Design a protein around this ligand. Structure first.
Ligand SMILES: [Ca+2]
Ligand SMILES: [Ca+2]
Ligand SMILES: [Ca+2]
Ligand SMILES: [Ca+2]
Ligand SMILES: [Ca+2]
Ligand SMILES: [Ca+2]
Ligand SMILES: [Ca+2]
Ligand SMILES: [Ca+2]
Ligand SMILES: [Cl-]
Ligand SMILES: [Cl-]
Lengths: 236, 5, 236, 5
C-alpha cells in the first residue's frame, strides 16, 4: 500500500481536501489507505469512502455508456467497417471500471462488513456491496452475468431485512437503499413491477412517519422521498 | 436514467 | 512508450473516442503516442493534442487554486495549526501539474517545433510553448521563476512575430495567441497596460478585416474577438 | 479569471 506510511488521520484530512478540489481519484486512494489501517470507520468516514468511489465509478460508467452506444451503432446494417478500435477502447474502459468495483468489493470483504455490527454501518456497507455488484452487472455479458446479478440481489436483500427490523421508515440510509434496490429491479433484474411496488411502499411508509421528525431530519428524508417519486413518475 | 444515491 | 505497439491511425481514432467520452487523460496519452511516431501532425491532429492537454492541465490548475487558497487561509493570524497535510497535498498536485507541463514542453522540443515550417503550425506550437511555461509560472515561487516567465515571454514573442508577418489579423490562431499573450502580461508579467493595449489593438485590427471573410470564417473570428472584449471589460 | 483559448 502506497498509503501505508501515512497516518490514518492525515489520510482522512487529505480525503476531505481532495473532495473540496474535486480530485475524486485521489480521494478514493486516501480512503482506501484509511480503510486498510484496519480500524472501523465512523459515519463521516463511511460517507467519504462512498462519495469518493461513487464519483470515480460514475465517470467510468458515463464513459462506458458513450463507447457502448458508438459500438452498437458500428454493428448496424449499412455501417462502414472501422476496425477493432472501438471495441478495444470500450474494453479498456470496462476493465478499469471492473477493477474499481473489485477494489471496493475487496475493502468491504476485508474487513468492513464482518466487523460492522450496528445496523447503520452494516446496512450502509451491504448497500455498497449491492451497488458495486450492480455496476458489474451493467457491463456483464458472459457466463457469470447471472451470478453477478444474484450477488447484487443477495446483498441488497440482507440490507433490506436489517433495515426493516432496526431502522425507522424515514431513515435516510433505509430510503436510499430502497431507492437503489428498486432501480436494480427495474434496470438489472427485468422486474419493473417489483421496482414500482418497492418505490411506492417505501414512499408511503416514510410519509406516515414524517410527523416524528425534527425540521432537519424532515428535510433529509423528504429529499430522498422526492427521488422515489421521480422514479415512479419516470416508470408510470 | 433513474435516480440512485 | 506504452503506445509504441499501437498504429498511429488507431491512436488518432481512439483520441477522438476519448474526447467523445470526456476521458481527457486517455486522450492525452493517445496523442502523446501519436506524436512519438515521429511524423508531423495535421491541423486536426494538432487540435486533438491541444484539447487533450488543455483539459488535463485545466483540471489540475483548478485543483491547485482550491488548495492554494486553503493553504493561504491556514497561514493567517488566528488560524489553528493543522499540521503539514495541506502543504503536502498542494505540493502533490503541483508536482503532477508540473509533470504534465514538462511532458507537453518535451513533445514540442522533441521534435514538433523544429519540423514545423508553415506559419500555421509553427505559430500553433509556439503558442502552446508559451501557454505551458505560463502554467509553470503560475505555481513558481523559487530561484527559477524569472527564467520561467522569460521562457513564456520568448515563445509568445516569436509566435507574435511570425503571426504578424504571415497571417491575416482575423486568423483564429493569431487572435487566440494575442488573447493569451495579453493574459500573460496581465496575470504573470505585472504589465496590465501592455495587456490592455494588446487586446485593444488586436480587436481593432481584426474588426477592420472582417469584410474579407466568408460567413463561417466571420463566425470563428468574431467569437474570439468577443473574448478579447470580455477581458477588456474585466480590466477597464 | 480572464479568458484564454
Ligand atoms: Ca505511504
Ligand atoms: Ca498511527
Ligand atoms: Ca470485458
Ligand atoms: Ca402491472
Ligand atoms: Ca503499445
Ligand atoms: Ca504503422
Ligand atoms: Ca513545489
Ligand atoms: Ca494607464
Ligand atoms: Cl485501447
Ligand atoms: Cl499528499
Amino acid at each position: 500500500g502506497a498509503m501505508g506510511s501515512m497516518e490514518r488521520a492525515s489520510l482522512i484530512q487529505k480525503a476531505k481536501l481532495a473532495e473540496q478540489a474535486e480530485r475524486y481519484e485521489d480521494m478514493a486512494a486516501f480512503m482506501k489507505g484509511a480503510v486498510e489501517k484496519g480500524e472501523e470507520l465512523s459515519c463521516e468516514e463511511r460517507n467519504l469512502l462512498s462519495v469518493a468511489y461513487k464519483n470515480v465509478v460514475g465517470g467510468q460508467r458515463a464513459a462506458w455508456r458513450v463507447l457502448s452506444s458508438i459500438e452498437q451503432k458500428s454493428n448496424e446494417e449499412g455501417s462502414e467497417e472501422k476496425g477493432p478500435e472501438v471495441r478495444e477502447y470500450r474494453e479498456k474502459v470496462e476493465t478499469e471500471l471492473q477493477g474499481v468495483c473489485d477494489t471496493v468489493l475487496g475493502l468491504l470483504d476485508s474487513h468492513l462488513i464482518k466487523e460492522a455490527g450496528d445496523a447503520e454501518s452494516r446496512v450502509f456497507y451491504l448497500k455498497m456491496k449491492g451497488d458495486y455488484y450492480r455496476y458489474l452487472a451493467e457491463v456483464a455479458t458472459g457466463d457469470d452475468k447471472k451470478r453477478i446479478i444474484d450477488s447484487a440481489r443477495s446483498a441488497y436483500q440482507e440490507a433490506m431485512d436489517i433495515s426493516k427490523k432496526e431502522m425507522p421508515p424515514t431513515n435516510p440510509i433505509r430510503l436510499g437503499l430502497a431507492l437503489n434496490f428498486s432501480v436494480f429491479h427495474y434496470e438489472i433484474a427485468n422486474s419493473p413491477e417489483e421496482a414500482i411496488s418497492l418505490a411506492k411502499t417505501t414512499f408511503d411508509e416514510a410519509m406516515a412517519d414524517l410527523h416524528t421528525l425534527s425540521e432537519d431530519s424532515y428535510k433529509d428524508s423528504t429529499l430522498i422521498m422526492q427521488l422515489l417519486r421521480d422514479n415512479l413518475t419516470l416508470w408510470t | 436514467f433513474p435516480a440512485t444515491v
